[PDB]
Amino acid sequence: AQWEFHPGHFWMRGKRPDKIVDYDEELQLWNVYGYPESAAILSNPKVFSSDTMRLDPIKLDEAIVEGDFAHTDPPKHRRLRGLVDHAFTPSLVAKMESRVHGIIHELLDGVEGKSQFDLVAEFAAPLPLIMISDLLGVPESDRALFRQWMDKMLDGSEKFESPETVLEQEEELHKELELLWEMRDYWHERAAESRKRPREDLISQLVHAEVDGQKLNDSQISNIANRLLVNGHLTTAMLIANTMLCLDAFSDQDARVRADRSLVPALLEESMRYMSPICGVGRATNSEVEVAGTVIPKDQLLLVWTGAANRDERQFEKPDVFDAGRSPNAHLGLGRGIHFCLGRQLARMESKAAVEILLDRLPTLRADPANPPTFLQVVDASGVATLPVVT
Numbered sequence: 270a271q272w273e274f275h276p277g278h279f280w281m282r283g284k285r286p287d288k289i290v291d292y293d294e295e296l297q298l299w300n301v302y303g304y305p306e307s308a309a310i311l312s313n314p315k316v317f318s319s320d321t322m323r324l325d326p327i328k329l330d331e332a333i334v335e336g337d338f339a340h341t342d343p344p345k346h347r348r349l350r351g352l353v354d355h356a357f358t359p360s361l362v363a364k365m366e367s368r369v370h371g372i373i374h375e376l377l378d379g380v381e382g383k384s385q386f387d388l389v390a391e392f393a394a395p396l397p398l399i400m401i402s403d404l405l406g407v408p409e410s411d412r413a414l415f416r417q418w419m420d421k422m423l424d425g426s427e428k429f430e431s432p433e434t435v436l437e438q439e440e441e442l443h444k445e446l447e448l449l450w451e452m453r454d455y456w457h458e459r460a461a462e463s464r465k466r467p468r469e470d471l472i473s474q475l476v477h478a479e480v481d482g483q484k485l486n487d488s489q490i491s492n493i494a495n496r497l498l499v500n501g502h503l504t505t506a507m508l509i510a511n512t513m514l515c516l517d518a519f520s521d522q523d524a525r526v527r528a529d530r531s532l533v534p535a536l537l538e539e540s541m542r543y544m545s546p547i548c549g550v551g552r553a554t555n556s557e558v559e560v561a562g563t564v565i566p567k568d569q570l571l572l573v574w575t576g577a578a579n580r581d582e583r584q585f586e587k588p589d590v591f592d593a594g595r596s597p598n599a600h601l602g603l604g605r606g607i608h609f610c611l612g613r614q615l616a617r618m619e620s621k622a623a624v625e626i627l628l629d630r631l632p633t634l635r636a637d638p639a640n641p642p643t644f645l646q647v648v649d650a651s652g653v654a655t656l657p658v659v660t
């Protein structure tokens with residue numbers, strides 16, 4: 270519908286890309302919009318690196334960014350990703366799903382007196398933030414410190430699609446550095462405290478974990494926790510809020526889901542296909558490559574538009590139709606390959622619980638017609654930042 274998407278997100282307005290691959294001369298980067306091409310790129314990490322900072326004229330020191338396996342390639346990626354995967358022990362997962370319904374009901378008890386409110390600010394954002402905070406074992410008071418950090422990182426994320434001078438890049442890189450130091454000194458004290466009093470959380474698991482036979486340092490622990498927070502917060506808030514927005518918009522699909530509650534998981538996946546919280550990811554070419562019959566030189570920044578790939582009619586029938594029960598749905602919303610979303614199970618468990626409970630407790634919940642949603646002002650994300658609702 271007449272929704273105010275990021276102007277760069279042409280696929281949300283039902284437009285096909287003119288070329289599967291193009292070059293942005295003003296930003297000095299390459300764009301890929303096709304599904305088979307994107308999928309192949311994500312499955313070829315040896316050629317398409319996730320270490321995009323390699324191409325920056327000004328960089329952070331490697332010791333400072335290590336542990337952020339989202340920007341790490343083989344052979345070192347698997348170790349890092351492995352510890353964290355492992356760290357998500359079967360007890361932890363169980364404990365998380367045991368807590369999510371409690372958190373959700375608690376949130377909605379918070380808006381019980383309100384006939385009108387912002388679903389994102391009141392519900393959809395706090396829930397995944399709270400879940401990850403508890404998983405990391407930080408006190409509730411520290412959830413504040415995280416929402417603070419997440420607007421600085423949301424601020425730095427914004428205007429990434431504007432051209433930047435080498436000096437502006439230095440300025441951004443220095444504010445990023447100050448924030449990494451504050452987090453590093455934070456996680457340093459959570460590590461100490463966890464060593465002093467271990468608990469049933471992820472940090473407790475991390476202080477014992479080892480790479481190359483050595484335990485992790487403050488920078489590794491900090492960069493892993495930061496990556497869980499940043500990757501798992503607003504992505505999940507958007508999936509929850511996009512999903513309620515789409516149900517409101519497509520009353521036929523809404524009716525299907527209310528009538529047949531077994532559709533909710535497939536609804537969430539289709540929500541991801543159709544309005545992809547992460548709608549593009551960055552890659553750097555290690556060598557010269559051909560993509561959709563287009564030659565891309567060595568050392569280039571390539572934006573893989575998973576949001577656009579997800580509307581590719583070569584992969585999906587009627588890709589611009591929202592189908593709550595869509596199957597099969599091998600969308601790229603969660604990535605593909607070695608960097609495939611680590612928190613996928615938690616994100617699906619949370620979102621499912623959230624939608625289900627919104628449907629049961631607030632069956633009259635609707636998008637406020639006097640007050641439309643706004644979309645997140647970040648080019649690699651397709652989702653709502655505000656969703657005023659009325660009961």
Ligand code: HEM
Pocket residue numbers: 319338339340350397401496497498500501502504505508541545546547550551601602603604605607608609610611612613615616
């Ligand atoms: C709707 C919810 C989510 C979406 C759409 C999403 C999306 C994605 C995507 C597209 C990637 C691939 C990145 C790339 O290839 O460059 C990814 C990876 C990742 N996700 Fe998620 N994510 C979500 C929720 C979560 C949650 C809840 C967590 C943690 C609690 C999380 C943690 C991570 C991590 C650590 C990675 C990096 C894995 C690696 O690089 O090996 N995400 N996610």
